[PDB]
Amino acid sequence: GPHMATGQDRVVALVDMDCFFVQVEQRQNPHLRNKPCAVVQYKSWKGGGIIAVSYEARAFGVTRSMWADDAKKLCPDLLLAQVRESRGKANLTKYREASVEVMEIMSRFAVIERASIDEAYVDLTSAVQERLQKLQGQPISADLLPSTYIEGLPQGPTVQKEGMRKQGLFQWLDSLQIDNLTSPDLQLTVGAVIVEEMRAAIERETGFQCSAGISHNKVLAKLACGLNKPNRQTLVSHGSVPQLFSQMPIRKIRSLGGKLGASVIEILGIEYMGELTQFTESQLQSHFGEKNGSWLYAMCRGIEHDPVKPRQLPKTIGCSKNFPGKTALATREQVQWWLLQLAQELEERLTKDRNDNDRVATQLVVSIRVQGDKRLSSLRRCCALTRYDAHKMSHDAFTVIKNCNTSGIQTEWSPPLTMLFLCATKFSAS
């Protein structure tokens, strides 16, 4: 009772940009706005591979990983924007720079964790405490939460979406205890007010819309965010968790979408997150390990302790290219040419990074895949990154991989290479 923690100590939000690469291209090209459209890379193989899709295009069934030629069969009027190609390869710079725009705005409100190119977590616990002071006990108006859903509401004793949103928000606000500065539900609510402000700032200053989740931890904030995407935010309270989790497939929880989550389902014979409550912590540790078992025991009760890490910048800068089918690299001059291409992009990004962010990478990671290997990497080795010089980095990369060429004739390369990867790591202040 009085000693059981309820994981209600923090306010955490997750901001996730809507159809991000599409919005970047739509800002640039007004002709793409409010249209079914998608972002594609490499036009020559079936119109290119789709990597992002507008909501209008999703209505037709267009999805990521579709070939654009195939997407056109579902959506004949689909518009496309192509990823930039430089030095023979797709180049994601425009989207990385657009991501910096958003992350810098979010950082004004709170210290962020850059989770991905278009997602960031924020811990709003401190900001909420401050705002609750300025809020000298006055009630929170529904007008301060114009795009907020309260998960699980309305409930109890209208057929249009916004109507329902407002009914749920009204039930929530009506039941709030605003005189108690330590009430978790009140803290979440103030967190949601701040996130409305944050999301308004992002849209005003960039043009980009996003969704957000507000809850007490990262897993619930992330789950919350997707519940009413796009262009809306969702508050998941501690009290909403039993119902929410009672029909929530285990794979929907972040980190459980792969083999571990499948093993949870198979070994325990359950389907939904809520069903995990019926196992003891030791039982879960016995099946899934000490760390995973404790994490699951707490998570299925809505409790998670993973902190929002103060990290706004990527920890690595990588350059990757696949060489599928017949395009696999079968000559030494090919391997050398493409290592240089990659190294040149890497050098460009590294020099900009060093100027912007006052740090230098000290390790170069070189990874390849040989044709016929079942593994995604046939070799992943490091060497020193002592100079931001493309010819040196490509020469060094060649040196660390040269002995995978089993061709007696070293002019040839066998087996052919189907992937090259260069990555700069282990940053030090500069």
Place this chain on the structure above:
DNA sequence: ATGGTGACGCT
């Protein structure tokens, strides 16, 4: 023949 990314865990 999705590809181009990127963080973190294990031994």
Place this chain on the structure above:
DNA sequence: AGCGTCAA
């Protein structure tokens, strides 16, 4: 360290 899992 090198490799694996999980994720945008």
